[PDB]
Amino acid sequence: DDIQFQVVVNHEEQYSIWPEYKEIPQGWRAAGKSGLKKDCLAYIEEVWTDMRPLSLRQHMD
């Protein structure tokens, strides 16, 4: 850690980390957490508990 990351989320409500210094790629947006890698990873673990893509949840539920 020395690099600030942002947690990013796509339209399927899947999460990744992305360096703050880079432009967020098309199809992704800020998910509401910036920080060191470990803190971003902790956040994703906290919030991503149903790992089915959103469209799969919609089809199954």
Side-chain angles (χ1 to χ4, degrees), residues 2-61:
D2 42 337
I3 300 304
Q4 289 287 303
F5 288 87
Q6 301 189 269
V7 174
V8 295
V9 62
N10 66 10
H11 289 131
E12 291 288 9
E13 216 179 273
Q14 301 171 318
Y15 302 90
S16 193
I17 59 170
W18 194 248
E20 199 136 78
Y21 66 81
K22 298 191 91 208
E23 292 298 283
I24 297 174
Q26 168 79 204
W28 297 82
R29 80 192 161 79
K33 176 71 173 184
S34 290
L36 300 175
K37 189 187 198 167
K38 78 170 196 161
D39 300 314
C40 290
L41 290 184
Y43 182 84
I44 292 167
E45 187 183 345
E46 185 198 5
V47 309
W48 198 12
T49 58
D50 181 351
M51 291 173 283
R52 293 175 301 169
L54 180 60
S55 64
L56 180 56
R57 297 177 208 157
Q58 289 167 344
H59 278 78
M60 293 186 69
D61 298 355

